[PDB]
């Protein structure tokens, strides 16, 4: 019994992180990933700094001393092989504590900033050590763009799984076709929390809207008419945080949210705020409207609320996935 699972979704949705969780759960190299982690750190600090003067209105530094640290970061921005001197971490840490730099970060949906920004900037004192060893969670946050197709093989209770990972960015989508034939099921991943952001490819198209269009293309594809789709509504942790913070309203991006009330079959988590329940179920339904419109009996869609970086949530959901695949597929 061998199941071939194909991961699909737009860029930065969470596909590569899902694969990592399979490796941790069902299957040394940590030293090699340190360089990638320091790059993420450098990219996060330089991006937030470069955006300060371009926003409308511009954000000002809370401390004049920090103007020199900004000048420092920008001068090393394009440097190819950065040796990461001890000074670099001192400046980054100093900048990240400046209230002005923090305010610019609260407006990050207005420019392009990686998701692991706050996670790495909060532990500069840990990463800077020469004796530093990346934790499991560090490797799960480390972002590295996917180019091409990658096959990961694992076994669970003597049942085989071949999982294919593909680049989600526009130019990468032209490779997916090579995995369509004889696929057991598709796992479509979505960044539920990216409703107030635009994609990188053009800097204008709404992220969630791009996912919706991409899903509609997959669901109605001529070569996937009988292929079921397991839908991962990812980034549940960032969704709740955004919803609760109340600064970026969902209905100001998707007007239809104002006519939406929580469904009966709704199963909120214990202690979950009604507002969070209302938002996550809304995003699920926009996806269900598409799957409901066609196919009828030939294939189905199975939604799941997920948080890729949370290994515990992934074990639980992948188990539910094993149930779906065996009941019919």
């Amino acid at each position: 019994a061998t199941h071939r699972l194909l991961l699909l979704g737009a860029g930065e949705s969470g596909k590569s992180t899902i694969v990592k969780q399979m490796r941790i759960l069902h299957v040394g190299e940590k030293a090699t990933k340190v360089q990638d982690i320091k790059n993420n750190l450098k990219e996060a600090i330089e991006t937030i700094v470069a955006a300060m003067s371009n926003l409308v209105p511009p954000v000002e530094l809370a401390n004049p001393e920090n103007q020199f640290r900004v000048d420092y970061i920008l001068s090393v921005m394009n440097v190819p092989d950065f040796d990461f001197p001890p000074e670099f971490y001192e400046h980054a840490k100093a900048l990240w504590e400046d209230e002005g730099v923090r305010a610019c970060y609260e407006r990050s949906n207005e420019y392009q900033l990686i998701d692991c920004a706050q996670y790495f900037l909060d532990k500069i004192d840990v990463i800077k050590q020469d004796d530093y060893v990346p934790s499991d969670q560090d490797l799960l946050r480390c972002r590295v763009l996917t180019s091409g197709i990658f096959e990961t093989k694992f076994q669970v209770d003597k049942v085989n799984f071949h999982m294919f990972d593909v680049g989600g960015q526009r130019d990468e989508r032209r490779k997916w076709i090579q995995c369509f034939n004889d696929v057991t099921a598709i796992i479509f991943v979505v960044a539920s929390s990216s409703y107030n952001m635009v994609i990188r490819e053009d800097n204008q198209t709404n992220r969630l809207q791009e996912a919706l269009n991409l899903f509609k293309s997959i669901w109605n594809n001529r070569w996937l008419r009988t292929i079921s789709v397991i839908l991962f509504l990812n980034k549940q942790d960032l969704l709740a945080e955004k919803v609760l913070a109340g600064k970026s309203k969902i209905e100001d991006y998707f007007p239809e949210f104002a006519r939406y009330t929580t469904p009966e079959d709704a199963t909120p988590e214990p202690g979950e705020d009604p507002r969070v329940t209302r938002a996550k179920y809304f995003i699920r339904d926009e996806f269900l409207r598409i799957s409901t419109a066609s196919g009828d009996g030939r294939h189905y869609c199975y939604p799941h609320f997920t948080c890729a970086v949370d290994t515990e949530n992934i074990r639980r959901v992948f188990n539910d996935c094993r149930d779906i695949i065996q009941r019919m597929l």
Binding site: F180, N181, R222, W223, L224, R225, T226, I227
Partner: protein
Amino acid sequence: MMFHKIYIQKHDNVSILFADIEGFTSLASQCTAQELVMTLNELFARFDKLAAENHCLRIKILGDCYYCVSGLPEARADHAHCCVEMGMDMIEAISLVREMTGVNVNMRVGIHSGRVHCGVLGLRKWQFDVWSNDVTLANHMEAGGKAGRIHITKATLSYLNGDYEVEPGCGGERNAYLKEHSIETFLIL
């Protein structure tokens, strides 16, 4: 089913030979369309017979481009030799048709060995064909070959077990594909 049924199968350890008329557009631009086809039919009929003798399966004729493979349908460990012997027969044949017809016909011959995918494509007008990087390379060897001689790759030389005397081909200096991919070529004597 989702996709149409594909009628293709993979085959390792085969040899591909390509032959092409030098300056064909120039040639057919001079004589009548009737005369040209007589010269080509006289030539390709002989090639098709020589193919049966040499254990080669002909693929197709692209106007002036003739090509076949050895090691199909049934696998043969004697493949590379068949194609070399086949190319040899072609060179003499072209010579006779050059003599009895008077037309200036000269062909370049290129050979390479590796894997291929063979079968058919589409729904209408099925014509057995082959596709693969190795088939693509074999094609370039012809483009990078020399008039009236057999041009082979290092991969084909390794299947020939040292039965033919060759000389440095220098195919890298006559075709950009062979250079870019770092291919060592040879010319059979």
